Each structure stands twice: as structure tokens, then as C-alpha cells.
Design a protein around this nucleic acid. Sequence first.
DNA 1: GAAGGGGGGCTATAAAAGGGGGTGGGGGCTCTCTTCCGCATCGC
Length: 179
Amino acid sequence: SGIVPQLQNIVSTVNLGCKLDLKTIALRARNAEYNPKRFAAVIMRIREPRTTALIFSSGKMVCTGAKSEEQSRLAARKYARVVQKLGFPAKFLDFKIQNMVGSCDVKFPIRLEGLVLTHQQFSSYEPELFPGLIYRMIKPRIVLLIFVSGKVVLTGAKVRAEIYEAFENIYPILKGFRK
DNA sequence: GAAGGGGGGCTATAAAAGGGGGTGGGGGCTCTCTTCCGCATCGC
């Protein structure tokens, strides 16, 4: 195909293995914001990795915004150290990547009306609700947002192989509905 | 001050986290016959 999707966002969850005091973290953490009325977690941001992480009292933390697997793990470790630097016994346990978001362009307009007809079992095109066709691939459990402009967004992948594999499967299908 | 324009939020997509709140599902017309009541009567 000659086109490789580029990851736009990765969601990874890591357990620190120790209960944390959310109020204490907000007071001392540099960028943390805690609003129990709004959300029950502590939202923190670190610019150099350019990622955002949510910290819960149970010790589990979710890291989002990383553009690569290495960045997500590095960003998650940095957040854990910040909590550890606050006097808590934070660790890096069962780090896992929960979601990978990738985007790409096929460089040609797509006839979404034709695509849904031939793939009604997997496609879902509702212009009233969303201007982009939602494709649910089965062999890889990846949900693809195909747009008339040609932009394709892949999400729900656990590994980078699924993102590339999913695009390889849909690209020939899109080529058959080129506008 | 009406109208077009610009910027931005909303919509859906996945996923994790944890808890509050929303939602749904149990539980403390005429004639005839029968029955009841008041009365006067005797009885003891």
C-alpha cells in the first residue's frame, strides 16, 4: 500500500501498588488538578513527553497522549516518580497499553455510500450522527473512522501490529470505492 | 440594529481508572314471597 498509519494517541494504565492521598498530591504536585465534585481522580500533565495522566486513590494510574509505546512507558514512569517523590511508595507494576489511536490519509476521496452497501455487516454510516463512516473490523478488533476526504482514523488497538494490520485490510476495500 | 462571519463546542471511536447518579425492578319495571319489628294479648 505504501502508507503506514502514524499513532496519534496511546492510552496505558499502570498500577503503583499503593494507596494514595489525592488531596495531598494536588497540593504538592506541580501540575496536578483535583476536583472531586467533577472527577474522582487527579489529573496531571508533563510537557516534555506531552502526555496527561490520571491518578486515583487506589494507586492505579492511566497515561494518555503518548505518541509511541516508548513515550507512554517513559511518561508513565515519570508520573510515578513524581508521586514517589512526594513520599508515597509508588512503583511500576503491570504496566500495559490499553488503547492506540492512529491516523492516516489514503490520498483520494472515498464513496462512503458505496462502502456501507458492500460492507453493511461491518460498516455504520449515519450522516445525521457523525459525518464519518464507522467500520468495525472483526479479525483485528479495530474500529476505523473513514471519511469522504480520505482521512482514516484507527483506534482500539492494543499493539502497533493491529494498527498496521487493520489498515492493510481496509486499504484494498477503500481502493474499490475510490471517488 | 439585522445579518453574515469567525471561533469554538458537539457529535462518535477506542480504552483505562473509581465513584455518584440515573434507571429499572420488588416490597410494606312489576309481581310475589320471605324476614324482622311493634303491638296487644294472655298467662304464671
